[PDB]
Dihydropteroate synthase
Amino acid sequence: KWDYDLRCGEYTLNLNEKTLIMGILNVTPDSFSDGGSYNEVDAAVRHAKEMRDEGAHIIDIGGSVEEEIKRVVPMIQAVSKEVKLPISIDTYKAEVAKQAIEAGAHIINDIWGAKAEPKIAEVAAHYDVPIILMHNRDNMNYRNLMADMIADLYDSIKIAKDAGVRDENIILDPGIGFAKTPEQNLEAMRNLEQLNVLGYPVLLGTSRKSFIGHVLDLPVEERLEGTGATVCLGIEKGCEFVRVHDVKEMSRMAKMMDAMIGK
Amino acid sequence: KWDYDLRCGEYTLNLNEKTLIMGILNVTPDSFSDGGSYNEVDAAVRHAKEMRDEGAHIIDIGGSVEEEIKRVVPMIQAVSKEVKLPISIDTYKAEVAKQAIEAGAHIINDIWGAKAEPKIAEVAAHYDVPIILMHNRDNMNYRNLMADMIADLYDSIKIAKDAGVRDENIILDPGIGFAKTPEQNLEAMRNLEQLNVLGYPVLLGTSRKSFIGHVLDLPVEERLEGTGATVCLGIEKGCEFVRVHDVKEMSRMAKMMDAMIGK
Ligand SMILES: CN1CC(C(=O)O)=Nc2c1nc(N)[nH]c2=O
Ligand SMILES: CN1CC(C(=O)O)=Nc2c1nc(N)[nH]c2=O
């Protein structure tokens, strides 16, 4: 039982009711504009709407600098305006983070857990938004995957907390498919429960990734069942959100898991 | 680690390699014959073949008396002849069991765990085939679901062993959707691991069932994700086979689970 709720300004997310579903917003960028043009933003809104209907709880948006903003800001403007859901912003850059939250984004999603740009934690602290700290590194000289993962994630927490970030605005993420061989990803999957000793909600993103292809020997568009299995173990191992492409399918697996495990 | 293999005469099933997939053979019966006619047997063979291609390890066949045989015997004859896989026979009747094994079936699948016709365990003992003892009762006056389930299953084991059945020819099954309310099924799902103390391989059959519909509020043809989730937890909780309709989909989830848990 989490003794608090995830506060997202306008929106609130309860962590005891269900596994929360983060939908990956896919942005096929107009090869012709810098950003903001009708086709890409319309497609993003449309797609945000579909995922809202498929049972999504968060819309994840993003995926240099000067024009990271120009691409991402108009999408957040349009989506928050048109879809009643918390939007997480997918960046490791401090300036982008500010602009996006200023544009209407509610959560930070940092694939570098404040190590790329430590300044981001201050933006997170300033606007008081929840920040997702994901495990990542430039190397895989793991002495001991899980011990190092937990050590690394903790170094992220230090940076966040030292910048003013409240414990209740911290979410952790094992960072599957990042700085981890196919076997290390499996090992992380198998030991997810260990991240719980840190005392923070955990998000898992395994949607359609390489290690699934590695196991099943199947291309990206053929990874739904593989993804499902990772989401189920993830829920069984105690994670609070899952970051997925297939919102309809994963929502139903999430919900069935929830019922069975008693969430 | 199981220190033995599942011996099915012509075929052998290793229990340490993977979760074994039992495909439910669906028999749309010719409304016109008693059994044996071309359309129903052709459809069964065809369907057996499809599941063999989708990654199935066992074909489950069956689903009065005098004509249980007439329906089921010609199907086993044709399928064993045409598909190189162990066939389980789905009956609680002693006479049917004999005929089916005589017709080429390898495993007994008893939804009454030898309580309907105790004589079946002797057939099982005689032909030396593996028998699946499923949990079942006529009532749900459970004092304590899991304690009673284990007690009941044990009463099945007694009957089997007393009739000559070797420990290594015994498989257990929690019997989801039988003599259990929607909540009791969930409770069984949540406590599957407890069946392991009995020391026998466990098979789980949850494919497309009511309790999935109950949770997700969805019709039978819409229960793939729900089924998937039950199969994943089942594998996580240590079961050895799953009995499913959707062989292609469940095979892939099974295989991804296997990789992650380290089977
Ligand atoms: C922004 N991305 C991207 C990502 C990927 O591209 O695989 N995975 C993840 C991610 N964010 C989070 N929080 N977790 C992921 O696994
Ligand atoms: C023959 N049937 C039928 C069945 C069902 O109709 O739900 N479930 C099961 C079954 N056999 C086994 N071993 N397990 C089941 O759950």
Observations:
- The two ends of chain A are 9 Å apart (CA to CA).
- Chain A touches chain B through 26 residues (CB under 8 Å).
